[PDB]
Write an enzyme that holds these catalytic residues in place. Structure first.
Site, PDB file in Angstrom:
ATOM      1  CB  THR A  55     -12.947  -8.686  -5.092  1.00 41.64           C
ATOM      2  OG1 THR A  55     -12.877  -8.627  -3.666  1.00 41.64           O
ATOM      3  CG2 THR A  55     -12.511 -10.049  -5.531  1.00 41.64           C
ATOM      4  CG  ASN A  66      -7.702  -3.118  -5.709  1.00 47.10           C
ATOM      5  OD1 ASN A  66      -6.715  -3.853  -5.652  1.00 47.10           O
ATOM      6  ND2 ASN A  66      -8.022  -2.278  -4.725  1.00 47.10           N
ATOM      7  CG  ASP A 117      -2.143   0.872   1.089  1.00 50.30           C
ATOM      8  OD1 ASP A 117      -2.406   1.442   0.012  1.00 50.30           O
ATOM      9  OD2 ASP A 117      -2.881   0.969   2.080  1.00 50.30           O
TER      10      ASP A 117
HETATM   11  C1  LIG Z   1       1.342  -4.597  -8.645  1.00 51.36           C
HETATM   12  C2  LIG Z   1       1.367  -3.550  -7.534  1.00 51.36           C
HETATM   13  C3  LIG Z   1       2.477  -2.483  -7.483  1.00 51.36           C
HETATM   14  C4  LIG Z   1       0.361  -3.577  -6.574  1.00 51.36           C
HETATM   15  C5  LIG Z   1       0.241  -2.708  -5.503  1.00 51.36           C
HETATM   16  C6  LIG Z   1      -1.058  -2.911  -4.729  1.00 51.36           C
HETATM   17  C7  LIG Z   1      -2.171  -2.071  -5.378  1.00 51.36           C
HETATM   18  C8  LIG Z   1      -3.528  -2.750  -5.263  1.00 51.36           C
HETATM   19  C9  LIG Z   1      -2.214  -0.619  -4.853  1.00 51.36           C
HETATM   20  C10 LIG Z   1      -1.343  -0.310  -3.627  1.00 51.36           C
HETATM   21  O1  LIG Z   1      -1.201   1.124  -3.458  1.00 51.36           O
HETATM   22  P1  LIG Z   1      -2.351   2.242  -3.549  1.00 51.36           P
HETATM   23  O2  LIG Z   1      -2.637   2.488  -4.978  1.00 51.36           O
HETATM   24  O3  LIG Z   1      -3.604   1.834  -2.797  1.00 51.36           O
HETATM   25  O4  LIG Z   1      -1.686   3.515  -2.887  1.00 51.36           O
HETATM   26  P2  LIG Z   1      -2.425   4.731  -2.181  1.00 51.36           P
HETATM   27  O5  LIG Z   1      -3.272   4.192  -1.045  1.00 51.36           O
HETATM   28  O6  LIG Z   1      -1.363   5.603  -1.669  1.00 51.36           O
HETATM   29  O7  LIG Z   1      -3.251   5.418  -3.247  1.00 51.36           O
HETATM   30 MG   LIG Z   2      -4.145   2.295  -0.813  1.00 56.06          MG
END
Ligand SMILES: CC(C)=CCC/C(C)=C\COP(=O)(O)OP(=O)(O)O
Ligand SMILES: [Mg+2]
Ligand SMILES: CC(C)=CCC/C(C)=C/COP(=O)(O)OP(=O)(O)O
Ligand SMILES: [Mg+2]
EC number: 2.5.1.86
Lengths: 284, 284
Positions: free
Chosen positions: A110, A112, A64
């Site tokens: 799921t 995302n 994250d």
């Molecule tokens: C293949 C890779 C690199 C996967 C990473 C995991 C993904 C689901 C997002 C993690 O960061 P985020 O986008 O949620 O970051 P933030 O919370 O800072 O927006």
């Molecule tokens: Mg995040």
């Protein structure tokens, strides 16, 4: 101990972030044997001496902070996801050095699907490409890798690249990585329940004989052991439906740093923290 | 705001731990309508002002540290458990003053059978007694309380007292308290699957139409909402199989204080932390 002894000073390092994607270095063979010793970290640091009985068997990581990392630098979201690829392999290398036997990674949830279509399309194509580009390296390292997740909506290309990686590495045993894509804890339990329901409908299962073990045996990947250490970066204190069945008695460690800034030394620090924790599983 | 105004300065306070069991004070009559204002804290602190939309809807508490608390004072572990009764009622009072709608308390888990026979025996009778002793008061505060848990091994007397509490309070609506005894997250999911399986065998359910919501609808208490905020005392950072299905997306706050030292102001502190944080994308 069960750590790898320190690397020879000259042994190749990783990651070199002077280019993207990061070129995984050629490794010496060291035969007669099988798996190559993972590259040493850039800083040349050594895995801490954690005894077998205090080391986590299975570590689950919710990666994250990619978006925040990108934003700090006025960069597109995508650029933070790209920087996270090297970190995955780095943590793989560190996991092996420390002696972790199971490693689950939350590559795509799921939930995302709620992100922008642009970001979802990038993340799907990115996961496809990463598995294709890294699976040969992972095989050399004695990594057994495979897909864990829900089929509906997930790009067939991503499933197919992981199936290839799974077949290539099915007899490796240094470490197992559950590469969780379109994964949902509730969803996985639901799919197990569907399987169970089908057996009952077919007259092959007495509802009264269904036990917790019945559910475990019908999960997509029944060989996954309980999560001992559940890690999440960026200081977010949420499990977010990751390894839901498996992590019921996991120790949680929430580290503040954003995923693209993370390296294997941070994994090691979390495992030392785990080592100090006393687990009781309900006993006095 | 949904908070109760600061209590009148002369309004009865709670708890006085100079008697065991603690005496719940006589409360001024409601002219009426029904539910009586809870006694205020000994400190006469008032609940912080938090918009109804920013509160956690459902707070789950893992009450922990009773044994360590007793041991610090050279007392038997059960003496720590005795002190936990007042803290439960104090937190119920504080949750009402803050305007919390749902509260789940982990009174005994499916894994606590691993403890000594003498401690288990005590906890069973203690839970039985607490429900009988506090039922009438909870009812008059507008609490809806009921048992959540698994039937095998649980003393029928505990189930029976809670059954009476449930019937007496079924029409209350100030707060709902899930009083979780012999509760196990994996076991509850398993019971739901058995339920589904029975329906399937009777033909009243099509296995291909089973969804996550089918599971939710077949949990023991299908009206329980998702846990928003999951709290655990004593410094331990683990969920220990509590509200497993329901806390999939919960935020965790871990407070170091031992349960017998806890009071409603600590509940308020955690809720304010939860409430004041910016609710980022991917958090409801
Ligand atoms: C293949 C890779 C690199 C996967 C990473 C995991 C993904 C689901 C997002 C993690 O960061 P985020 O986008 O949620 O970051 P933030 O919370 O800072 O927006
Ligand atoms: Mg995040
Ligand atoms: C108010 C009620 C019904 C409490 C019962 C909670 C139960 C799970 C024991 C928690 O303390 P503990 O025994 O686990 O303490 P410690 O971890 O210090 O041994
Ligand atoms: Mg405890």
């Amino acid at each position: 101990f069960p750590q790898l002894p320190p690397a020879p000073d000259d042994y190749p390092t990783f990651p070199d972030t002077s280019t993207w994607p990061v070129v995984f270095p050629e490794l010496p063979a060291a035969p007669y044997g099988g798996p190559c010793r993972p590259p040493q970290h850039t800083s040349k640091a050594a895995a801490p001496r954690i005894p077998a009985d205090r080391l986590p068997n299975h570590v689950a990581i919710v990666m994250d902070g990619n978006g925040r990392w990108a934003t700090q630098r006025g960069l597109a979201r995508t650029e933070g996801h790209k920087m996270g690829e090297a970190v995955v392999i780095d943590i793989a290398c560190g996991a092996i050095e420390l002696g972790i036997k199971w490693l689950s990674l939350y590559a795509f949830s799921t939930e995302n699907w709620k992100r922008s279509p642009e970001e979802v399309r990038f993340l799907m194509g990115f996961n496809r490409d990463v598995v294709r580009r890294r699976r040969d390296t992972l095989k050399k390292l004695g990594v057994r890798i495979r897909w864990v997740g829900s089929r509906p909506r997930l790009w067939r290309s991503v499933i197919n690249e992981l199936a290839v990686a799974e077949e290539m590495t099915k007899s490796n045993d240094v470490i197992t990585i559950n590469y969780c894509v379109n994964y949902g804890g509730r969803t996985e339990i639901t799919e197990a329940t569907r399987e169970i329901a089908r057996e009952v409908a077919a007259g092959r299962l007495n509802p009264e004989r269904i036990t917790e073990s019945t559910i475990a045996r019908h999960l997509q990947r029944p060989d996954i052991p309980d999560v001992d250490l559940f890690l999440r970066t960026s200081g977010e204190q949420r499990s977010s439906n990751f390894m839901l069945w498996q992590a019921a008695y996991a120790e949680y460690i929430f580290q503040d740093k954003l995923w693209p800034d993370y390296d294997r030394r941070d994994l090691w620090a979390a495992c030392e923290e785990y080592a100090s924790r006393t687990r009781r599983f309900g006993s006095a």
